[PDB]
Design a protein around this nucleic acid. Structure first.
Ligand SMILES: Nc1nc2c(ncn2[C@H]2C[C@H](O)[C@@H](COP(=O)(O)NP(=O)(O)OP(=O)(O)O)O2)c(=O)[nH]1
Ligand SMILES: [Ca+2]
Ligand SMILES: [K+]
Length: 430
DNA sequence: ATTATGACGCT
DNA sequence: AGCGTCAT
């Protein structure tokens, strides 16, 4: 009743760049703009692997993880841009730099959490309080929300999608109580005004378009962001959650797309998020553990407490390369040469990070996969990272992995290595 | 032979 | 500390 907290205390947005790597390449090369196009890494094996797809190309069925040769079967006029290669490997520097552009613009409006190379959470609670004091109880015009969808509207008592969007927005706005400066729906609406401004700034100052979700927590903001891509933003109110969740497959919610979500489905015999409401918190905890159970109990009611961390920079800086099938590394010289290539990219990125961001990594994590192991990592060993020197780092990585070499002959490497991964972690201010 | 990462939980 | 999960 009056004591049942509703998780409406914060305004949180999730901003995600549309087809990011594609937009980066389309900005650089105007010939790619407004075309079916994709970004690929490598080329020799089946045309390279696609990692980003323009919405025009998505209409033909082109997806991430598909081989370019197969994508061209679906879309023969598909245009392709390849990731840069340096020291024998993919080099994603261009996209990391573009990410910094976007992240710095977002940081002007509020503290952000960098969730991935092209998406960030935004805690707008305080900014919304400020804008509400400025408005002085003035209603919010639809002209202030020109790309916003209100999830679940229109409802009740009309042919084209922009007309739909506007009807829903008008129903939402006419129902607003702009008198109460503590109304959560009003707070979300003002948050959406601010996100319109942030998205306008990103597009004006970088050329990049993005989608966004506005809700009361990170999971709902993320789900909202996905509802109307590309180049649009969606407000998911607390009140919209029962209908939204009533037909939402469990796997669509961030963190439930894997084994845990499959176990929720199998153990409880349910399919949709909303079905979780019928279980007690203790029941959920008994199946899925304390933390998961409390989280599911709150989440299926639209409530989640995970804070937006004030973290604009990545916590780790890593370099990895797969050596699949017959390219696997089977000689000591091979393993040393590739460890050195990775360590050289790592040194470059670390040196630039230290100059930009006034910090130094102190731990080097070395991960490998051996042939036949289906796991991502077959082995992970750490050592100290005392100097940004590639030869040092690569020699140290070899020292921590060399006992994995089954071969008695210290010139061969068996079983051959199908992945190498160097990761700098545990940063300290410098 | 979806690849190159990046986050975070568990013990 | 090393491993597993999730993500994409
Ligand atoms: N190296 C690599 N990069 C990847 C991979 N997957 C994605 N990226 C890169 C390429 C992506 O551009 C970028 C951001 O990932 P998303 O947000 O998941 N996809 P996008 O922004 O393209 O589409 P949407 O409009 O649906 O948000 O990360 C991968 O497996 N490997
Ligand atoms: Ca994106
Ligand atoms: K993303």
């Amino acid at each position: 009743g009056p004591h049942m907290a509703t998780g409406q205390d914060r305004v949180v947005a999730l901003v995600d760049m549309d087809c990011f790597f594609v937009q980066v390449e389309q900005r650089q090369n105007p010939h790619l703009r407004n075309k079916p196009c994709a970004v690929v890494q490598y080329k020799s094996w089946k045309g390279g692997g696609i990692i980003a797809v323009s919405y025009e190309a998505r209409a033909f069925g082109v997806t991430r993880s598909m081989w370019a040769d197969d994508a061209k079967k679906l879309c023969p006029d598909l245009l392709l841009a390849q990731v840069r290669e340096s020291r024998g490997k993919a080099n994603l520097t261009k996209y990391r730099e573009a990410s910094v552009e976007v992240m710095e613009i977002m940081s002007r409006f509020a503290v952000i959490e960098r969730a991935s190379i092209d998406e960030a959470y935004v805690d707008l609670t305080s900014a919304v309080q400020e804008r509400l004091q400025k408005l002085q109880g003035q209603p919010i015009s639809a002209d202030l929300l020109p790309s916003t969808y209100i999830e679940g509207l229109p409802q009740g008592p009309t042919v084209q999608k922009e007309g739909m969007r506007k009807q829903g927005l008008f129903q939402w706005l006419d129902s607003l109580q702009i008198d109460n400066l503590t109304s959560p729906d009003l707070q979300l609406t003002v948050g959406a005004v601010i996100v319109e401004e942030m998205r306008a700034a990103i597009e004006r100052e970088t050329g990049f378009q993005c989608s966004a979700g506005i809700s009361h927590n990170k999971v709902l903001a993320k789900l909202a962001c996905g509802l109307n891509k590309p180049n649009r933003q969606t407000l998911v109110s607390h009140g919209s959650v029962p209908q939204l969740f009533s037909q939402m497959p469990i796997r669509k919610i961030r963190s439930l797309g894997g084994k845990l979500g499959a176990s929720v489905i199998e153990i409880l015999g349910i399919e949709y998020m909303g079905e979780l409401t019928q279980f007690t918190e203790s029941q959920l905890q008994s199946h899925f553990g304390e933390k998961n159970g409390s989280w599911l109990y709150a989440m299926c009611r639209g409530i989640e407490h995970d804070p937006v961390k004030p973290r604009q920079l990545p916590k780790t800086i890593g370099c990895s390369k797969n050596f699949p099938g017959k390219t696997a590394l089977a000689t000591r010289e091979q393993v040393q040469w590739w460890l050195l290539q990775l360590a050289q990219e790592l040194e470059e990125r670390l040196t630039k990070d230290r100059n930009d961001n006034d910090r130094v990594a102190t731990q080097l994590v070395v991960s490998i996969r051996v042939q036949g192991d289906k796991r991502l990592s077959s082995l992970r060993r750490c050592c100290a990272l005392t100097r940004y020197d590639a030869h040092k780092m690569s020699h140290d990585a070899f020292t921590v992995i060399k006992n994995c070499n089954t071969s008695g002959i210290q010139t061969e490497w068996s079983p051959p290595l199908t992945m190498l991964f160097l990761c700098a972690t545990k940063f300290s201010a410098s």
